[PDB]
Tab-separated table of C-alpha atoms and ligand atoms in Angstrom:
chain	number	residue	atom	x	y	z
A	10	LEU	CA	16.007	-5.669	25.664
A	11	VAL	CA	16.092	-4.152	29.226
A	12	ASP	CA	12.727	-3.571	30.919
A	13	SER	CA	11.628	-0.177	32.489
A	14	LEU	CA	8.618	0.564	30.296
A	15	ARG	CA	5.446	2.292	31.422
A	16	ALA	CA	3.339	1.433	28.352
A	17	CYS	CA	2.094	-1.337	26.089
A	18	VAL	CA	0.581	0.056	22.930
A	19	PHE	CA	-1.320	-2.369	20.731
A	20	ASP	CA	-2.301	-2.154	17.136
A	21	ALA	CA	-5.847	-3.425	16.951
A	22	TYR	CA	-6.845	-4.721	13.524
A	23	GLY	CA	-4.887	-7.881	12.969
A	24	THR	CA	-3.208	-7.887	16.370
A	25	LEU	CA	-5.957	-8.142	18.933
A	26	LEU	CA	-8.916	-8.407	16.530
A	27	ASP	CA	-8.997	-11.071	13.897
A	28	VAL	CA	-9.835	-9.491	10.510
A	29	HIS	CA	-9.739	-12.889	8.712
A	30	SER	CA	-12.924	-13.773	10.569
A	31	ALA	CA	-14.787	-11.068	8.640
A	32	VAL	CA	-14.863	-13.062	5.437
A	33	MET	CA	-14.338	-16.440	7.180
A	34	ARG	CA	-17.517	-16.110	9.258
A	35	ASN	CA	-19.296	-15.570	5.803
A	36	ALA	CA	-17.262	-17.673	3.410
A	37	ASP	CA	-20.229	-19.817	2.239
A	38	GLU	CA	-22.192	-16.707	1.218
A	39	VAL	CA	-19.210	-15.352	-0.724
A	40	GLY	CA	-18.423	-18.614	-2.561
A	41	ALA	CA	-15.106	-20.025	-3.730
A	42	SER	CA	-13.629	-16.579	-4.163
A	43	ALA	CA	-13.584	-15.900	-0.404
A	44	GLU	CA	-9.908	-16.079	0.329
A	45	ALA	CA	-8.959	-13.921	-2.660
A	46	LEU	CA	-11.655	-11.379	-1.765
A	47	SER	CA	-10.532	-11.290	1.800
A	48	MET	CA	-6.976	-10.704	0.696
A	49	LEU	CA	-7.871	-7.901	-1.762
A	50	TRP	CA	-10.053	-6.192	0.789
A	51	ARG	CA	-7.193	-6.035	3.327
A	52	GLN	CA	-4.638	-4.865	0.742
A	53	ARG	CA	-6.832	-2.056	-0.558
A	54	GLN	CA	-8.060	-0.756	2.765
A	55	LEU	CA	-4.348	-0.228	3.532
A	56	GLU	CA	-3.567	1.176	0.130
A	57	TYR	CA	-6.327	3.746	0.509
A	58	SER	CA	-4.945	4.645	3.981
A	59	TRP	CA	-1.370	5.211	2.708
A	60	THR	CA	-2.101	6.931	-0.558
A	61	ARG	CA	-4.795	9.187	0.901
A	62	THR	CA	-2.367	10.541	3.425
A	63	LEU	CA	0.356	11.035	0.853
A	64	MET	CA	-2.004	12.842	-1.465
A	65	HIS	CA	-3.503	14.904	1.458
A	66	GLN	CA	-7.040	13.575	1.205
A	67	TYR	CA	-7.916	11.911	4.498
A	68	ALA	CA	-11.153	10.035	5.030
A	69	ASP	CA	-11.980	7.923	8.027
A	70	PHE	CA	-11.057	4.295	8.277
A	71	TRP	CA	-14.575	3.065	8.048
A	72	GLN	CA	-15.213	4.720	4.689
A	73	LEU	CA	-11.902	3.309	3.456
A	74	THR	CA	-13.033	-0.141	4.622
A	75	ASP	CA	-16.364	0.350	2.860
A	76	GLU	CA	-14.733	1.705	-0.380
A	77	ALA	CA	-12.198	-1.115	-0.361
A	78	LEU	CA	-14.853	-3.762	0.147
A	79	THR	CA	-16.988	-2.426	-2.692
A	80	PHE	CA	-14.001	-2.484	-4.960
A	81	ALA	CA	-13.200	-6.047	-4.088
A	82	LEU	CA	-16.792	-7.307	-4.553
A	83	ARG	CA	-16.901	-5.736	-8.052
A	84	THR	CA	-13.460	-7.050	-8.941
A	85	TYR	CA	-14.859	-10.550	-8.295
A	86	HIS	CA	-18.124	-9.845	-10.160
A	87	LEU	CA	-20.183	-11.195	-7.208
A	88	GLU	CA	-23.999	-11.687	-7.288
A	89	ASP	CA	-25.876	-9.824	-4.555
A	90	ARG	CA	-23.134	-7.310	-3.900
A	91	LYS	CA	-25.706	-5.351	-1.873
A	92	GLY	CA	-26.313	-8.199	0.571
A	93	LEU	CA	-22.688	-9.259	0.921
A	94	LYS	CA	-21.581	-5.633	1.622
A	95	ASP	CA	-24.129	-5.427	4.451
A	96	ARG	CA	-23.245	-8.904	5.877
A	97	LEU	CA	-19.475	-8.165	5.604
A	98	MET	CA	-19.298	-4.570	6.932
A	99	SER	CA	-21.283	-5.862	9.912
A	100	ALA	CA	-18.894	-8.693	10.488
A	101	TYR	CA	-16.085	-6.178	10.380
A	102	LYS	CA	-17.778	-3.917	12.874
A	103	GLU	CA	-17.711	-6.859	15.236
A	104	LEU	CA	-14.477	-8.738	14.590
A	105	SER	CA	-13.580	-11.450	17.072
A	106	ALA	CA	-10.657	-11.214	19.402
A	107	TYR	CA	-7.742	-13.587	18.956
A	108	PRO	CA	-8.273	-16.181	21.662
A	109	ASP	CA	-5.527	-14.764	23.847
A	110	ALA	CA	-6.136	-11.063	23.523
A	111	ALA	CA	-8.293	-10.473	26.628
A	112	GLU	CA	-6.393	-12.543	29.147
A	113	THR	CA	-3.000	-11.289	28.095
A	114	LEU	CA	-4.200	-7.677	28.267
A	115	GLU	CA	-5.741	-8.427	31.676
A	116	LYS	CA	-2.343	-9.732	32.805
A	117	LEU	CA	-0.531	-6.688	31.589
A	118	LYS	CA	-3.073	-4.210	33.020
A	119	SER	CA	-2.815	-5.776	36.413
A	120	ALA	CA	0.974	-5.615	36.101
A	121	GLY	CA	0.886	-1.840	36.245
A	122	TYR	CA	1.569	-1.049	32.563
A	123	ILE	CA	-0.548	1.467	30.823
A	124	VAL	CA	-2.290	-0.749	28.274
A	125	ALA	CA	-3.519	1.167	25.150
A	126	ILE	CA	-4.674	0.703	21.590
A	127	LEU	CA	-3.177	2.798	18.763
A	128	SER	CA	-5.241	2.063	15.679
A	129	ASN	CA	-6.131	3.416	12.272
A	130	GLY	CA	-9.890	2.896	12.863
A	131	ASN	CA	-12.256	5.743	13.825
A	132	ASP	CA	-13.567	5.443	17.333
A	133	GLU	CA	-16.947	4.145	16.189
A	134	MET	CA	-15.893	0.938	14.370
A	135	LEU	CA	-13.186	0.508	16.998
A	136	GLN	CA	-15.579	0.942	20.000
A	137	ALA	CA	-18.115	-1.425	18.551
A	138	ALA	CA	-15.462	-4.102	18.130
A	139	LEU	CA	-14.006	-3.654	21.576
A	140	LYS	CA	-17.528	-3.748	22.948
A	141	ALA	CA	-18.465	-6.861	21.031
A	142	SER	CA	-15.393	-8.827	22.113
A	143	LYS	CA	-15.483	-7.281	25.589
A	144	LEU	CA	-11.991	-5.860	25.490
A	145	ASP	CA	-13.559	-2.554	26.508
A	146	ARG	CA	-12.820	-3.534	30.109
A	147	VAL	CA	-9.163	-4.461	29.762
A	148	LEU	CA	-7.955	-1.095	28.382
A	149	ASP	CA	-6.636	2.140	29.846
A	150	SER	CA	-6.859	3.999	26.566
A	151	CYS	CA	-7.782	3.656	22.903
A	152	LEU	CA	-6.222	6.108	20.462
A	153	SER	CA	-7.395	6.786	16.858
A	154	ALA	CA	-5.726	8.124	13.722
A	155	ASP	CA	-9.076	9.796	13.132
A	156	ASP	CA	-8.199	12.186	15.964
A	157	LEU	CA	-5.357	13.524	13.787
A	158	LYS	CA	-6.719	12.768	10.309
A	159	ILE	CA	-3.365	11.087	9.556
A	160	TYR	CA	-2.592	7.367	8.954
A	161	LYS	CA	0.169	5.112	10.221
A	162	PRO	CA	3.210	4.810	9.721
A	163	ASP	CA	3.343	8.587	9.660
A	164	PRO	CA	5.468	9.532	12.621
A	165	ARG	CA	2.824	12.009	13.942
A	166	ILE	CA	0.579	9.212	15.095
A	167	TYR	CA	3.190	7.421	17.135
A	168	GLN	CA	3.939	10.976	18.512
A	169	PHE	CA	0.301	11.555	19.406
A	170	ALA	CA	0.465	8.360	21.497
A	171	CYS	CA	3.410	9.659	23.585
A	172	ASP	CA	1.518	12.906	23.974
A	173	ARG	CA	-1.732	11.360	25.052
A	174	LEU	CA	-0.218	8.674	27.206
A	175	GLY	CA	2.377	11.066	28.642
A	176	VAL	CA	5.399	8.830	27.964
A	177	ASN	CA	8.647	8.928	26.017
A	178	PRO	CA	9.177	6.755	22.913
A	179	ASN	CA	11.516	4.344	24.715
A	180	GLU	CA	9.095	3.779	27.568
A	181	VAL	CA	6.696	2.198	25.034
A	182	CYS	CA	6.390	-1.412	23.967
A	183	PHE	CA	4.566	-1.391	20.641
A	184	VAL	CA	2.949	-4.646	19.726
A	185	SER	CA	1.669	-5.393	16.288
A	186	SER	CA	1.207	-7.977	13.538
A	187	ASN	CA	2.042	-5.667	10.692
A	188	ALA	CA	5.675	-5.405	9.709
A	189	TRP	CA	5.026	-1.907	8.219
A	190	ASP	CA	3.392	-0.647	11.429
A	191	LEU	CA	6.373	-2.061	13.390
A	192	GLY	CA	8.816	-0.446	10.984
A	193	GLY	CA	7.102	2.868	11.322
A	194	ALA	CA	6.833	2.606	15.120
A	195	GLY	CA	10.416	1.544	15.553
A	196	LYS	CA	11.809	4.195	13.284
A	197	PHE	CA	9.940	6.598	15.480
A	198	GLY	CA	11.401	5.116	18.655
A	199	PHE	CA	9.105	2.605	20.281
A	200	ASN	CA	10.329	-0.770	21.417
A	201	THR	CA	8.713	-2.982	18.868
A	202	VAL	CA	7.513	-6.533	19.385
A	203	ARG	CA	5.981	-8.405	16.401
A	204	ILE	CA	3.163	-10.941	16.738
A	205	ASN	CA	3.977	-13.243	13.865
A	206	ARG	CA	1.464	-16.027	13.897
A	207	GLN	CA	2.223	-17.848	10.679
A	208	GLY	CA	5.909	-17.229	10.455
A	209	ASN	CA	6.028	-14.932	7.449
A	210	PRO	CA	9.426	-13.737	6.284
A	211	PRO	CA	10.915	-10.466	7.748
A	212	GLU	CA	10.523	-7.001	6.223
A	213	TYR	CA	11.613	-3.465	7.256
A	214	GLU	CA	15.056	-4.534	8.420
A	215	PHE	CA	16.169	-0.910	8.927
A	216	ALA	CA	13.890	-0.693	11.986
A	217	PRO	CA	14.925	-3.926	13.686
A	218	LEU	CA	12.512	-5.690	16.018
A	219	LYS	CA	13.230	-5.966	19.721
A	220	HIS	CA	11.527	-9.349	19.652
A	221	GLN	CA	9.226	-11.493	17.582
A	222	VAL	CA	6.777	-13.978	19.143
A	223	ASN	CA	4.014	-16.059	17.641
A	224	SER	CA	1.130	-15.401	20.010
A	225	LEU	CA	-0.287	-12.714	22.300
A	226	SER	CA	0.215	-15.084	25.194
A	227	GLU	CA	4.012	-15.068	24.628
A	228	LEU	CA	4.003	-11.422	25.334
A	229	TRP	CA	3.471	-12.321	28.989
A	230	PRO	CA	6.920	-13.861	29.685
A	231	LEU	CA	8.287	-11.050	27.619
A	232	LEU	CA	6.912	-8.295	29.797
A	233	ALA	CA	5.987	-9.660	33.200
A	234	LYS	CA	7.513	-7.529	35.984
A	235	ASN	CA	9.287	-8.384	39.292
B	10	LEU	CA	-10.732	21.407	-20.590
B	11	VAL	CA	-10.033	19.510	-23.856
B	12	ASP	CA	-7.182	21.029	-26.049
B	13	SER	CA	-4.975	23.767	-24.526
B	14	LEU	CA	-2.753	20.864	-23.349
B	15	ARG	CA	0.980	21.058	-23.928
B	16	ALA	CA	2.225	17.862	-22.297
B	17	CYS	CA	1.426	14.193	-21.910
B	18	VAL	CA	3.026	12.687	-18.893
B	19	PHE	CA	3.168	8.875	-18.642
B	20	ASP	CA	3.662	6.555	-15.790
B	21	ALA	CA	6.218	3.860	-16.771
B	22	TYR	CA	5.819	0.653	-14.761
B	23	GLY	CA	2.393	-0.644	-15.500
B	24	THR	CA	1.438	1.953	-18.077
B	25	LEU	CA	4.011	1.966	-20.911
B	26	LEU	CA	6.048	-0.927	-19.512
B	27	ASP	CA	4.416	-4.321	-18.870
B	28	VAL	CA	5.165	-5.704	-15.383
B	29	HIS	CA	3.236	-8.962	-15.896
B	30	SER	CA	5.818	-9.926	-18.463
B	31	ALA	CA	8.493	-10.319	-15.810
B	32	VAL	CA	6.910	-13.301	-14.216
B	33	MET	CA	4.932	-14.317	-17.260
B	34	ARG	CA	8.082	-14.901	-19.245
B	35	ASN	CA	9.402	-17.115	-16.435
B	36	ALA	CA	6.126	-18.708	-15.376
B	37	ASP	CA	7.361	-22.213	-16.261
B	38	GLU	CA	10.454	-21.864	-14.100
B	39	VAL	CA	8.379	-20.421	-11.221
B	40	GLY	CA	5.538	-22.982	-11.210
B	41	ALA	CA	1.830	-22.802	-10.476
B	42	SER	CA	2.101	-19.942	-8.031
B	43	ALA	CA	3.425	-17.606	-10.741
B	44	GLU	CA	0.344	-15.451	-10.950
B	45	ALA	CA	0.019	-15.260	-7.101
B	46	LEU	CA	3.733	-14.498	-6.815
B	47	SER	CA	3.384	-11.828	-9.471
B	48	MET	CA	0.582	-9.999	-7.636
B	49	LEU	CA	2.339	-10.259	-4.321
B	50	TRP	CA	5.456	-8.684	-5.876
B	51	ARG	CA	3.499	-5.792	-7.365
B	52	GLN	CA	1.575	-5.162	-4.124
B	53	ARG	CA	4.714	-5.161	-1.969
B	54	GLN	CA	6.836	-3.059	-4.289
B	55	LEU	CA	4.243	-0.300	-4.023
B	56	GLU	CA	3.575	-0.861	-0.318
B	57	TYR	CA	7.218	-0.263	0.405
B	58	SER	CA	7.234	2.891	-1.713
B	59	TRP	CA	4.271	4.390	0.106
B	60	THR	CA	5.024	3.353	3.652
B	61	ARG	CA	8.736	4.287	3.386
B	62	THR	CA	7.886	7.681	2.076
B	63	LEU	CA	5.327	8.117	4.935
B	64	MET	CA	7.939	7.191	7.638
B	65	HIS	CA	10.725	9.224	6.062
B	66	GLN	CA	12.922	6.233	5.117
B	67	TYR	CA	13.468	6.493	1.362
B	68	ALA	CA	15.288	3.783	-0.577
B	69	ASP	CA	15.240	3.727	-4.356
B	70	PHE	CA	12.875	1.722	-6.583
B	71	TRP	CA	15.362	-0.935	-7.582
B	72	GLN	CA	15.957	-1.768	-3.917
B	73	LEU	CA	12.272	-1.917	-3.152
B	74	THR	CA	11.742	-4.102	-6.224
B	75	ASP	CA	14.432	-6.393	-4.838
B	76	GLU	CA	13.039	-6.507	-1.375
B	77	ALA	CA	9.552	-7.166	-2.556
B	78	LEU	CA	10.694	-9.959	-4.856
B	79	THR	CA	12.639	-11.598	-2.048
B	80	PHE	CA	9.663	-11.305	0.266
B	81	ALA	CA	7.303	-12.793	-2.402
B	82	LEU	CA	9.576	-15.767	-3.252
B	83	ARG	CA	10.057	-16.575	0.422
B	84	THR	CA	6.325	-16.319	1.107
B	85	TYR	CA	5.698	-18.991	-1.542
B	86	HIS	CA	8.536	-21.141	-0.073
B	87	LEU	CA	9.801	-21.482	-3.614
B	88	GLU	CA	12.861	-23.470	-4.591
B	89	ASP	CA	16.022	-22.162	-6.292
B	90	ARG	CA	15.278	-18.654	-4.986
B	91	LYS	CA	18.777	-17.457	-5.856
B	92	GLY	CA	18.384	-18.356	-9.554
B	93	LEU	CA	14.812	-17.395	-9.501
B	94	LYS	CA	15.737	-13.958	-8.147
B	95	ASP	CA	18.353	-13.265	-10.887
B	96	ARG	CA	15.964	-14.368	-13.662
B	97	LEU	CA	13.113	-12.230	-12.341
B	98	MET	CA	15.266	-9.186	-11.530
B	99	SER	CA	16.797	-9.222	-15.046
B	100	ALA	CA	13.318	-9.662	-16.467
B	101	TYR	CA	12.301	-6.483	-14.560
B	102	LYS	CA	15.477	-4.604	-15.555
B	103	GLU	CA	14.446	-5.036	-19.177
B	104	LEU	CA	10.637	-5.129	-19.074
B	105	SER	CA	9.007	-5.179	-22.497
B	106	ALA	CA	6.689	-2.340	-23.630
B	107	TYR	CA	3.022	-2.688	-24.314
B	108	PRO	CA	2.487	-3.574	-27.957
B	109	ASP	CA	1.499	-0.012	-28.832
B	110	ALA	CA	3.635	2.097	-26.532
B	111	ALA	CA	6.277	3.136	-29.118
B	112	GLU	CA	3.898	4.182	-31.893
B	113	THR	CA	1.498	6.124	-29.761
B	114	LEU	CA	4.319	8.001	-28.040
B	115	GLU	CA	5.980	8.744	-31.376
B	116	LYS	CA	2.660	9.910	-32.787
B	117	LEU	CA	2.060	12.159	-29.783
B	118	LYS	CA	5.561	13.661	-29.882
B	119	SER	CA	5.379	14.487	-33.579
B	120	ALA	CA	1.870	16.002	-33.167
B	121	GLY	CA	3.928	18.647	-31.289
B	122	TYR	CA	3.309	17.492	-27.654
B	123	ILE	CA	5.931	17.476	-24.932
B	124	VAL	CA	6.105	13.783	-24.163
B	125	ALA	CA	7.500	12.624	-20.826
B	126	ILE	CA	7.664	9.770	-18.330
B	127	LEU	CA	7.219	10.518	-14.675
B	128	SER	CA	8.092	7.348	-12.764
B	129	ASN	CA	9.000	5.890	-9.370
B	130	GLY	CA	11.835	4.075	-11.128
B	131	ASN	CA	15.369	5.266	-10.458
B	132	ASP	CA	17.573	6.149	-13.483
B	133	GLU	CA	19.499	2.982	-13.904
B	134	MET	CA	16.416	0.799	-13.933
B	135	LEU	CA	14.402	3.199	-15.941
B	136	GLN	CA	17.068	3.813	-18.529
B	137	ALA	CA	17.790	0.124	-18.934
B	138	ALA	CA	14.109	-0.509	-19.392
B	139	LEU	CA	13.700	2.320	-21.869
B	140	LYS	CA	16.797	1.367	-23.880
B	141	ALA	CA	15.797	-2.261	-24.118
B	142	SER	CA	12.257	-1.547	-25.209
B	143	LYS	CA	13.319	1.215	-27.633
B	144	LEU	CA	11.076	3.736	-25.840
B	145	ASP	CA	14.103	5.880	-25.147
B	146	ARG	CA	14.192	7.777	-28.396
B	147	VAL	CA	10.554	8.805	-28.509
B	148	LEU	CA	10.534	10.843	-25.256
B	149	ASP	CA	11.381	14.470	-24.546
B	150	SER	CA	11.966	13.706	-20.871
B	151	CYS	CA	12.264	10.981	-18.320
B	152	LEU	CA	11.646	12.185	-14.722
B	153	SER	CA	12.448	10.035	-11.751
B	154	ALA	CA	11.177	10.070	-8.206
B	155	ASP	CA	14.732	9.322	-7.113
B	156	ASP	CA	15.742	12.908	-7.946
B	157	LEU	CA	13.521	13.912	-5.000
B	158	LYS	CA	13.700	10.871	-2.675
B	159	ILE	CA	9.899	11.058	-2.402
B	160	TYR	CA	7.472	8.676	-4.086
B	161	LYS	CA	4.161	9.001	-5.816
B	162	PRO	CA	1.630	10.207	-5.024
B	163	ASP	CA	2.934	12.914	-2.690
B	164	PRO	CA	2.122	16.133	-4.579
B	165	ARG	CA	5.759	17.214	-4.788
B	166	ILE	CA	6.475	14.501	-7.382
B	167	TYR	CA	3.802	15.850	-9.766
B	168	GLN	CA	4.979	19.371	-8.961
B	169	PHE	CA	8.451	18.190	-10.142
B	170	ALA	CA	6.951	17.333	-13.508
B	171	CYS	CA	5.464	20.882	-13.849
B	172	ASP	CA	8.682	22.457	-12.757
B	173	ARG	CA	11.010	20.515	-15.090
B	174	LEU	CA	8.609	20.711	-18.020
B	175	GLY	CA	7.851	24.365	-17.535
B	176	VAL	CA	4.109	23.870	-17.866
B	177	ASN	CA	1.151	24.390	-15.534
B	178	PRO	CA	-0.951	21.560	-14.074
B	179	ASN	CA	-3.910	22.096	-16.454
B	180	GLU	CA	-1.603	21.904	-19.471
B	181	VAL	CA	-0.584	18.321	-18.643
B	182	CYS	CA	-2.326	15.130	-19.716
B	183	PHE	CA	-1.352	12.422	-17.251
B	184	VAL	CA	-1.695	8.874	-18.565
B	185	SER	CA	-1.519	5.865	-16.283
B	186	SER	CA	-3.112	2.475	-15.464
B	187	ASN	CA	-2.941	2.865	-11.702
B	188	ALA	CA	-5.968	4.382	-10.024
B	189	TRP	CA	-3.927	5.658	-7.093
B	190	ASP	CA	-1.414	7.307	-9.413
B	191	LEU	CA	-4.259	8.886	-11.380
B	192	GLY	CA	-5.778	9.868	-7.980
B	193	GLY	CA	-2.584	11.608	-6.953
B	194	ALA	CA	-2.109	13.434	-10.239
B	195	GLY	CA	-5.820	14.270	-10.484
B	196	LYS	CA	-5.908	15.827	-7.031
B	197	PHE	CA	-2.811	17.795	-7.790
B	198	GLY	CA	-4.372	19.311	-10.886
B	199	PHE	CA	-3.310	17.307	-14.010
B	200	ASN	CA	-5.872	16.206	-16.543
B	201	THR	CA	-6.091	12.505	-16.119
B	202	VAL	CA	-6.532	9.669	-18.571
B	203	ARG	CA	-6.703	6.091	-17.388
B	204	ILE	CA	-5.577	3.258	-19.566
B	205	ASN	CA	-7.964	0.646	-18.142
B	206	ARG	CA	-7.045	-2.482	-20.178
B	207	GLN	CA	-8.845	-5.172	-18.224
B	208	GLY	CA	-11.971	-3.178	-17.310
B	209	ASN	CA	-11.343	-2.707	-13.535
B	210	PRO	CA	-13.988	-1.058	-11.361
B	211	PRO	CA	-13.466	2.587	-10.313
B	212	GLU	CA	-11.497	3.954	-7.354
B	213	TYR	CA	-10.196	7.354	-6.079
B	214	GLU	CA	-13.372	8.868	-7.248
B	215	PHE	CA	-12.872	12.194	-5.537
B	216	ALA	CA	-10.357	12.903	-8.330
B	217	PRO	CA	-12.483	12.103	-11.398
B	218	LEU	CA	-10.957	11.205	-14.779
B	219	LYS	CA	-10.953	13.292	-17.945
B	220	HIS	CA	-11.273	10.106	-19.998
B	221	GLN	CA	-10.776	6.362	-19.943
B	222	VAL	CA	-9.593	4.078	-22.736
B	223	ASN	CA	-8.809	0.409	-22.796
B	224	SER	CA	-5.622	0.741	-24.772
B	225	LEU	CA	-2.699	3.088	-25.400
B	226	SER	CA	-3.622	3.185	-29.052
B	227	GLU	CA	-7.037	4.670	-28.153
B	228	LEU	CA	-5.063	7.612	-26.834
B	229	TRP	CA	-4.353	8.783	-30.372
B	230	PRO	CA	-7.878	9.373	-31.711
B	231	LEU	CA	-8.460	11.242	-28.439
B	232	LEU	CA	-5.337	13.487	-28.377
B	233	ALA	CA	-4.938	14.521	-32.073
B	234	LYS	CA	-4.022	18.286	-31.978
C	1	CL	CL1	5.229	12.946	4.380
């Protein structure tokens, strides 16, 4: 819609950092089960995030990641679970950026937006990954659920972003790949833009998107200022 | 604790009612992605229940079931989605019980236990499923998350069971096949028993189990009062 926004808030894992690369970078070691493992790891890490907040038993995102990975390795009865867990947690700690992430953030930063991350991950796994892909240098601020001990899409975390960044919901453009994160952010009040790389079908229709695009780079036409 | 229990509370979908059967009974019409499509439908049904309850946007279980099925079928670019959606919805409306559900419930009831379902399902879907599988008449109570507009495993749902059943947490035996549901109940105070049919690895360990069995019928040796 109309364009007087002070802030671009990014989800990290799956939006700017490519989680698929965790298992992809190590697919040969895993064996033919790699896709399925990858998929179960993602789904569980999120399950553990959502259920743990509903049952009032927070733990940090890294331990969730770890717990979820262990579960998935056992599910698939893999040899050398010890080795694979090491190899794969490490690969997670240093996920690669989508090819466009840095440049498009650079373009937004130098356009006068506050450019921030709002992620589930504790600062440690998050910092290591921003360091490794060098997105450290293209960010004003990086905000963690771990600061509140609460997971998305709980409205408190979107709230904490307004608080920390000193902006109102409607002065935020919230960019993410996860329909549930966009549904949660929108219901809260952010202008939501979905990065939909593969064209998956829509979900969370009650919190309609402001726009969908298929690439970080398309954000640039979407947001560039006079 | 072992035997000052007054109540067995069962999860429905996935514990007494078999959700595989919905797709499994239509596998041939669906094609080779059946088993994928089935998992995706289960994972999305639940995702919607948890994330909607987290963002304060409740819709009932039938709707979420519908949305998740639509999303799944689209994802697999399947053909004849319309007909495929009616077949699969109806299959879910009247899910068939596990082979042993009836007997073991009826044995538990008549051993003097209060015998209840506590489900995410709303009434219409739950009643249709309990009628069709004949599980209706062997239950003292059927308790639905849609009375609260809050899903498992927020504590208030398990609290609802206590309240309506007039028992305390430690007097309830909570039977389910879902680790997260067991997690939720465990943490809230129920005594937990997992029906782990396929031998899945553990999860939600901070809320340990009272017992695990691989079948509903193994619940009987264990709970004889
Ligand atoms: Cl809540």
